[PDB]
Amino acid sequence: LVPIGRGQRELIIGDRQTGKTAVAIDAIIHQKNCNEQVPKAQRVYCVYVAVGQKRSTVAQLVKLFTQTGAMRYTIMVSATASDAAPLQFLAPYSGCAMAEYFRDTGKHGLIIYDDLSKQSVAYRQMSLLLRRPPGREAFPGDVFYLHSRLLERAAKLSKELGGGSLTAFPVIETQAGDVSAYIATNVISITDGQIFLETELFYKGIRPALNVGLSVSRVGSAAQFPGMKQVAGTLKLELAQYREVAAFAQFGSDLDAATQYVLERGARLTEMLKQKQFAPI
Amino acid sequence: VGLSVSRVGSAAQFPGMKQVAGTLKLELAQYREVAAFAQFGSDLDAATQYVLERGARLTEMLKQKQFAPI
Amino acid sequence: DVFYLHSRLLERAAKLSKELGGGSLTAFPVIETQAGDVSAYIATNVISITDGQIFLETELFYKGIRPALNVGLSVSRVGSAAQFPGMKQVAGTLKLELAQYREVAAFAQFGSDLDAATQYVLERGARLTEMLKQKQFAPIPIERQTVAVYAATKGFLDKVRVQDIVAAEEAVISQVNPAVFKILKANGKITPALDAHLKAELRKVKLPGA
Amino acid sequence: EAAAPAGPKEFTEVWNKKAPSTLIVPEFPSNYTAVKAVGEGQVHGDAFPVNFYTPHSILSQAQKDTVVLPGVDGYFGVKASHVPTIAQLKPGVVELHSGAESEKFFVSGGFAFVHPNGVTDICVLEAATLDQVDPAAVKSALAAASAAQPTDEFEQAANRAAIELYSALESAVEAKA
Amino acid sequence: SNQAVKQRIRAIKNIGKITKAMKMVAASKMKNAQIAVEQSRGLVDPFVRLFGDFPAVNSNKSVVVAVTSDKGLCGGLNSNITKYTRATLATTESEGKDVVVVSIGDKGRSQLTRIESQRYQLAIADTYKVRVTFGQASLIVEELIKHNPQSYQILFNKFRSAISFKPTVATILSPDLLEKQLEDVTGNSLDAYDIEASHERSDVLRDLTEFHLGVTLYNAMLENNCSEHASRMSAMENSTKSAGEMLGKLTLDYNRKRQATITTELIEIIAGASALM
Amino acid sequence: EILVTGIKVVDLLAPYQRGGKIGLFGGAGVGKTVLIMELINNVAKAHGGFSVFAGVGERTREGNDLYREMIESGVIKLGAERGNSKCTLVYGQMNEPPGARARVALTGLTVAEYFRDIEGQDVLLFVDNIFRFTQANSEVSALLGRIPSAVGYQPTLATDLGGLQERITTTTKGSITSVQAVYVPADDLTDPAPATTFAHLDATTVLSRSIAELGIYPAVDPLDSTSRMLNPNVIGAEHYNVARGVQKVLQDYKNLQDIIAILGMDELSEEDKLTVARARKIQRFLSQPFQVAEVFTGTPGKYVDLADTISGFQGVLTGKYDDLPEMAFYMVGDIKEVKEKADKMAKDIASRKEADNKKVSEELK
Amino acid sequence: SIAELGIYPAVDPLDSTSRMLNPNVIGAEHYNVARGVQKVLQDYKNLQDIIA
Amino acid sequence: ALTGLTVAEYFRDIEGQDVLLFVDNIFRFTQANSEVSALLGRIPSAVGYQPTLATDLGGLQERITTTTKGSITSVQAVYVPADDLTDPAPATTFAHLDATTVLSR
Numbered sequence A: 001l002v003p004i005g006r007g008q009r010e011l012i013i014g015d016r017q018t019g020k021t022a023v024a025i026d027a028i029i030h031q032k033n034c035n036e037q038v039p040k041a042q043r044v045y046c047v048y049v050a051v052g053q054k055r056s057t058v059a060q061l062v063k064l065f066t067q068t069g070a071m072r073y074t075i076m077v078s079a080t081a082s083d084a085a086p087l088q089f090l091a092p093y094s095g096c097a098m099a100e101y102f103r104d105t106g107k108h109g110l111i112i113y114d115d116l117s118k119q120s121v122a123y124r125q126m127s128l129l130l131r132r133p134p135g136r137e138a139f140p141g142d143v144f145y146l147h148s149r150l151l152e153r154a155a156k157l158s159k160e161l162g163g164g165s166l167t168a169f170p171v172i173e174t175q176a177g178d179v180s181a182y183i184a185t186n187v188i189s190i191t192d193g194q195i196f197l198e199t200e201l202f203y204k205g206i207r208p209a210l211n212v213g214l215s216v217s218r219v220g221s222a223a224q225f226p227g228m229k230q231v232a233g234t235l236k237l238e239l240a241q242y243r244e245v246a247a248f249a250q251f252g253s254d255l256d257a258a259t260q261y262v263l264e265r266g267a268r269l270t271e272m273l274k275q276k277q278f279a280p281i
Numbered sequence B: 001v002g003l004s005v006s007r008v009g010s011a012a013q014f015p016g017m018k019q020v021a022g023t024l025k026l027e028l029a030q031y032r033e034v035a036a037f038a039q040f041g042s043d044l045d046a047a048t049q050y051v052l053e054r055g056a057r058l059t060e061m062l063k064q065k066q067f068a069p070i
Numbered sequence C: 001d002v003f004y005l006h007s008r009l010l011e012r013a014a015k016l017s018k019e020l021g022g023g024s025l026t027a028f029p030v031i032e033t034q035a036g037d038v039s040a041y042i043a044t045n046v047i048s049i050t051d052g053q054i055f056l057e058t059e060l061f062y063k064g065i066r067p068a069l070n071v072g073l074s075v076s077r078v079g080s081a082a083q084f085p086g087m088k089q090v091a092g093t094l095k096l097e098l099a100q101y102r103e104v105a106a107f108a109q110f111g112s113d114l115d116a117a118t119q120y121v122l123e124r125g126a127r128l129t130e131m132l133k134q135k136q137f138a139p140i141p142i143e144r145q146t147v148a149v150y151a152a153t154k155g156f157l158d159k160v161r162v163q164d165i166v167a168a169e170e171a172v173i174s175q176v177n178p179a180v181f182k183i184l185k186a187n188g189k190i191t192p193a194l195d196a197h198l199k200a201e202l203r204k205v206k207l208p209g210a
Numbered sequence D: 001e002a003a004a005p006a007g008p009k010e011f012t013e014v015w016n017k018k019a020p021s022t023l024i025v026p027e028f029p030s031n032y033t034a035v036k037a038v039g040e041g042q043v044h045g046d047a048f049p050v051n052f053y054t055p056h057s058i059l060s061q062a063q064k065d066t067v068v069l070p071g072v073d074g075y076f077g078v079k080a081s082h083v084p085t086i087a088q089l090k091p092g093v094v095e096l097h098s099g100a101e102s103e104k105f106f107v108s109g110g111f112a113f114v115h116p117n118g119v120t121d122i123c124v125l126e127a128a129t130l131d132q133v134d135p136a137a138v139k140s141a142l143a144a145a146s147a148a149q150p151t152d153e154f155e156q157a158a159n160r161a162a163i164e165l166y167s168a169l170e171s172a173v174e175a176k177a
Numbered sequence E: 001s002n003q004a005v006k007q008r009i010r011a012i013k014n015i016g017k018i019t020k021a022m023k024m025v026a027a028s029k030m031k032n033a034q035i036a037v038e039q040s041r042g043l044v045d046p047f048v049r050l051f052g053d054f055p056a057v058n059s060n061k062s063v064v065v066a067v068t069s070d071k072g073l074c075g076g077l078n079s080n081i082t083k084y085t086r087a088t089l090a091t092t093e094s095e096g097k098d099v100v101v102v103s104i105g106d107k108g109r110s111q112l113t114r115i116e117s118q119r120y121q122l123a124i125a126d127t128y129k130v131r132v133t134f135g136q137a138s139l140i141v142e143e144l145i146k147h148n149p150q151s152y153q154i155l156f157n158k159f160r161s162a163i164s165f166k167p168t169v170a171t172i173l174s175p176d177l178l179e180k181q182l183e184d185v186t187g188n189s190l191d192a193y194d195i196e197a198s199h200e201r202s203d204v205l206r207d208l209t210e211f212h213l214g215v216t217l218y219n220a221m222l223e224n225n226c227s228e229h230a231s232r233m234s235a236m237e238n239s240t241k242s243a244g245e246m247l248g249k250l251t252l253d254y255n256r257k258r259q260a261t262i263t264t265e266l267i268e269i270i271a272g273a274s275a276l277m
Numbered sequence F: 001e002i003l004v005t006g007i008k009v010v011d012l013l014a015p016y017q018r019g020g021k022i023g024l025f026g027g028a029g030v031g032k033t034v035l036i037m038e039l040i041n042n043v044a045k046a047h048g049g050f051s052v053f054a055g056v057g058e059r060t061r062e063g064n065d066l067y068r069e070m071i072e073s074g075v076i077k078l079g080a081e082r083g084n085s086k087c088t089l090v091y092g093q094m095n096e097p098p099g100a101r102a103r104v105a106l107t108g109l110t111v112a113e114y115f116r117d118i119e120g121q122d123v124l125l126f127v128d129n130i131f132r133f134t135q136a137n138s139e140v141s142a143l144l145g146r147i148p149s150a151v152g153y154q155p156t157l158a159t160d161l162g163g164l165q166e167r168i169t170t171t172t173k174g175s176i177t178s179v180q181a182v183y184v185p186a187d188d189l190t191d192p193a194p195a196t197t198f199a200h201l202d203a204t205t206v207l208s209r210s211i212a213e214l215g216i217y218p219a220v221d222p223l224d225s226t227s228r229m230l231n232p233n234v235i236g237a238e239h240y241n242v243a244r245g246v247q248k249v250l251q252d253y254k255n256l257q258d259i260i261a262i263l264g265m266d267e268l269s270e271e272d273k274l275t276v277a278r279a280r281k282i283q284r285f286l287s288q289p290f291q292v293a294e295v296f297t298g299t300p301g302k303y304v305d306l307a308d309t310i311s312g313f314q315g316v317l318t319g320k321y322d323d324l325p326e327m328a329f330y331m332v333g334d335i336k337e338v339k340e341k342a343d344k345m346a347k348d349i350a351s352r353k354e355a356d357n358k359k360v361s362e363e364l365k
Numbered sequence G: 001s002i003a004e005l006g007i008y009p010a011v012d013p014l015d016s017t018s019r020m021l022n023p024n025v026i027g028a029e030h031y032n033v034a035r036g037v038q039k040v041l042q043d044y045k046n047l048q049d050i051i052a
Numbered sequence H: 001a002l003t004g005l006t007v008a009e010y011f012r013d014i015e016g017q018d019v020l021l022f023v024d025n026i027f028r029f030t031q032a033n034s035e036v037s038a039l040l041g042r043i044p045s046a047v048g049y050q051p052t053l054a055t056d057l058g059g060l061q062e063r064i065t066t067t068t069k070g071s072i073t074s075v076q077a078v079y080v081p082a083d084d085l086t087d088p089a090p091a092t093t094f095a096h097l098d099a100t101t102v103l104s105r
């Protein structure tokens, strides 16, 4: 539904404990499964930047990337919560520089900035203690330039420069599904796509809790699988029809034997897009 | 019409227009109270349907056409 | 530091140990709330300082239920099992019956479907919430409250309908022989001899609802 | 032979055993009628209660003294303490009299009962006053009704009812008083 | 998140005017369909003072009808009839008698199948779309006569007033299949009457019970329609109450969010200005 | 590895880790001190290590209550038996100045970190209101000449809180199971101090006031309480599937509640009526009497084993207990007691009289 | 809202204005069809809260 | 409003009368004192008001009382800002009010 090309930056935005990291860990583990099958030139080397997290949270990911085997291709840049505020502000740039090595020398990179919303809090702390005057919520004026300097480094290079690529997955945590925040509306404006994960879809069983009505991909049908370009065009065409009819039929007024078809078919597709935790298909 | 007022009011109205606007605004107040129920046409009420029909008449009266003042 | 303002104030309300004299200090902070918003800043500050709350509602106060005590929200956990023993023997049934009255008023805010056992808990709850409401500037001693809620959480008032309960409890306080108030004050609780004399004395009471 | 003596009272007693007890007894059509057949009285001399009914109206319920009913043997009349009767009516004129004044309803047929307590219940489907029929369309329709004569005894029985109702309407409209 | 609350106030306020419209619609339909209900109430009376009221009779075959509503905002009317369906349908059960259950109205088609699915045979629906006529009730009586039981049960709601609709079971017995067999006491009570039919008494009762079924079915589905409209008028009365108390809670919480928005934007502006001066 | 707490909603929906940071999130009067006391009573006796209770910014009356009840149950021993004590108390209660309440959590951490690093064994650290640490540094930070951050807080909220929280871990040489009560300032879970401390915990049990106002205690929001242990490779697929099915039923009822409040339950589907009935039963079944609440509720408390929790909630999910009413599930231990209370409520539907004569309270008894 | 329906270009017909929408600029046959299309799309939105 | 108060306090304290004071729009008194508090560079309190809102209102309203000489009875028109009674200017005014007379259309 929201396919991702190489060189595209895609925001994984969601509320507090949705499946945001689990979407990004599955993108990294899956590159291990593809790197064994592709030739050496089109292998994707992943970098996971862990900003402001626990140190034992990232120790659970090194243990997961080891026992899957993705740590052969993975760099982890870990600026935990006990690190200084300039080490968490600068760790997305350090991870982007470690991943720009593969972009600049003709290979392919995958950078994941887990909680850019925790990098901007580390940036706000230095800016308020360097006595730079605060703006919205307290943030510095240049906090759009903070993230657009960083996400614009994810590019698909020309073939003169090697044809290399760097694909970004910034993660932004919202508060109550409020994407109208300051840092949220900045990164929505920077990145191409958006994977919006909803906490109410999470508990209905739909995991990955992807809001299919709000999740975009600006590259779109340009860089998806051609075998699923001709199948998932019909899939989003039906799930768009599922959404408005279920708003009416939960009142329980009346049903129409083809309105009955679209909320019975869209339930086949909603259960189809569910998935387990660490098994990329 | 519900939110537009004049604290001077009808003391500075054209007399003759004051003869007819005083019942025009009452008819439009009754129409605004029974408004948004005009989608119930098959579900007719025969006392509020008259003020609903006349309110739909009178809102079509006060429309104008852009730099043709009357 | 507006939490610290009230916390360092109310923490001085203590009960001292016997090595410090055994003195006490009971605090009643009062917080005005805007439109019932208990989730305000200063309100939730003082709620997390004090040992309980007494919630007084505008919807009970406008109806004349005065004091307008929100029984589902009011709480006092440190004073519980430290109250009057006769009142503790009587009032658990009162808290439970007002709880079930709140349940069946939470189910039926409009009256058309009557189970006739739900009508019983409705009539008992309406009797008890007429019992607990009182007038201003006249506090009652605890034995005259114990006997008054003893006469209500039991029978003895179902003859009286819903209006004359304010006169019924005054008739009960007046016509009960005032020795049983002295025994209830002195003993601390209703002894079974006193329960016998109290069941006896609540039968020769001339209720105004007749 | 009548070993199940039912009623509202027996159904009340048995229904308190198999239904849940909080459910009030379902009402019955007996509970909205103060008038019965075996309940003697309601006579008072010359005028008797005539319950001229209709599915879509109640045309009369006051007491009248003589009713001309168009039964299938022929027109008969009901005075006050008449014999009990269950009379099927052919399409004809039910005449209600209170004295010299007569209101003439031409009905479509349907039964008319006289009970032991003197109440009479005329029960017809379409019960028009004979004022509101025109004398033109009846022979205009009977000319066609005397034409389509098929072997289909459903349609032929409908034609028989058609020519008989139309003939009775004609013979009641030429014979005005 | 401050615009989610404003659009939720928008939703609750439009719902609260929709339900206030439907309350007045149901009240308008209740008065101009009560002028047809107590007109048809008369004709049920000669058949009950002629044939009597025999609900609990040991029928071999029985067709029970629960006539319910078509539209669905009636508010627990059809469910009350669905529960009195089994409450009066278990009080018939004395010898293992056959029962056919039949529902008039779309909201009885969905509700009897949860409780009695093997004994369901017919769904009459779209009956109150234009109006209720006696030829319509005659055709429904015809299709209830296609299979010919010994008794008929009609379950509906008797429109007493706009407040009470205490439900009704009306019973109609097949002509001498059980009806005159329920009449014979030391002789009979039906033998007082002179049968003035063309053919025998066994055919005048055959015609007379089909006419009684048509009259009872017509009055049942007319009283049920008027009690449906009054039940909907009382159901959308509580809906505007709920959509007003929810609106008042949402308006109070919006006022809190408005005040907090002005305070937090002001504290941001003051902190920006104080870091320069 | 799981930590069994004997609490139905905690063990079912957000199970605790034996070396994990656990947070209890609440809004002034929803029950996180009562939950932290019940967790003390259930966990800190089977767990054979040492305990540290760091009281930060709470009532002095509650510190005296916990101290006296620990002397009673022998967890704290006085005099020459002092070496057989199991708990050490560090107190910075709400009468202290802001500098004292800003450092007392570090004192309790130091006492816990000695037992973790030097004695090399498992510690239980209970911190009542780690929010008061952040609030105390926010009182202090105004007078230090700092530009304030969001809502009113210090610019260093995340880093002060993270520097305190990253010390509270289990290392390779010892364990600290941490339970922190977290206060939410105006029932505002988006306030920067709760929103910052959400990312430091392995299991976040969020207590709601709307759950508490329905009488359901512990007032745990089941659709807001999470764990890293709710993972089928960690707890087993039986537990995980029961927990996710319970959450699916509760979320479906939450989506229906806006319709039910307006149009009533008469407008629902029969499928919707089934899920509303089942969800009301599993809402009441998540409530539980506490042993520490019985001194003011009067109902004795129940420790519900985890196997009983899984089996009972699976039975209420599949529809094995649709025969029982809603209030049979309210404030009972396990599914044996639902059927016991459902027999008893039904039994008391008749027995309401015959206290007429034959008394022991006539004049000469 | 227009984009989630799949109507592309997702131009809000009511909210999009121009100064070229006078009848003395673009003629009356254009002006009255544009205003009629807007009126039909507006009272559809007033009905849409009751269709749902 | 203080000038009107002084004229009323002369009739109370020297003439010994039951004076009537009419503060026309007490909310505009609040709004004016909020403007002079904003212009003197003070940090505004809640929603936007002066930090001294309760005392700048109570300094006016506490001079309206009954003395032993006479009294001042004040009839103050009250405007409620966003039809919001929990706004701090009417919530501070309503603490001082002893009666409301709502005039209805």
Ligand SMILES: Nc1ncnc2c1ncn2[C@@H]1O[C@H](COP(=O)(O)OP(=O)(O)OP(=O)(O)O)[C@@H](O)[C@H]1O
Binding pocket: A014, A015, A016, A017, A018, A019, A020, A021, A022, A023, A207, A208, A275, A276, A277, F199, F227, F228, F229, F230, F231
């Ligand atoms: N596709 C999935 N299927 C089942 N469970 C899932 C899935 N994705 C995530 N989960 C569960 O949801 C919980 C939260 O996942 P995750 O760690 O991704 O949250 P998050 O969005 O990263 O929030 P935070 O950054 O606060 O941890 C995890 O414990 C995981 O077990």
Ligand SMILES: Nc1ncnc2c1ncn2[C@@H]1O[C@H](COP(=O)(O)OP(=O)(O)O)[C@@H](O)[C@H]1O
Binding pocket: C048, C075, C077, F026, F027, F028, F029, F030, F031, F032, F033, F034, F035, F217, F218, F219, F288, F289, F290, F293, F297
């Ligand atoms: N499990 C429970 N059973 C009964 N009452 C409870 C329970 N939990 C909380 N309460 C009630 O909630 C009140 C506040 O709980 P407490 O933990 O003291 O508040 P806080 O969450 O502010 O620390 C208690 O006084 C108690 O009455």
Ligand SMILES: [Mg+2]
Binding pocket: A020, A021
């Ligand atoms: Mg994460």
Ligand SMILES: [Mg+2]
Binding pocket: F032, F033, F058
């Ligand atoms: Mg506490």
